[PDB]
Amino acid sequence: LPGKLADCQERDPALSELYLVEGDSAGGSAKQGRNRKNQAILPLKGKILNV
DNA sequence: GTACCTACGGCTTATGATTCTTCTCGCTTCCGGCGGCATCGGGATGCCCGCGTTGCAGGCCA
Incomplete structure (x- = not known):
């Protein structure tokens, strides 16, 4: 819950x-340009292992 | 694709210590009430005489 999630x-x-983008490259500007009413962003790190 | 460490200097703020304000224990002993009796100075009551109080009308003041 802490760290990256910004409800x-x-x-x-x-x-x-809810959104899913690259953390340090995109999430910064995404949070700096989003709204503070009904916007939430969950950053990511690299890729995800296959199932 | 991403995280965690300290040196270079200054003000503050997050917590254990010391001087100033205050809360009130101890009774006991010199001292302050407390009551009774002789004493003394005042005054209320009475009479006399002149002065303090008040009404009238005028000139002065806020």
Whole structure:
């Protein structure tokens, strides 16, 4: 929960949005240019192992 | 693709210590009430006489 996740002010689901981008390259400007009402961004690190 | 360490210098803020404010234990002993009796100075009551109080009308003041 800490570290990377930055939720919005609203807590009721089906109203907010979630995004998945590169952390240090994209998430910075994404948070600096997003809204603080119904916006949430979850950064990522590199790739993800296959299933 | 990403994280964690200290030196170079200054103000502050996050917590254990010391002088100033205060809360009130101890009773006991010199001292302060407390009551009774002889004493003394004041005054209320009475009479006399002149002065303090008040009403009228005028000139001065806030």
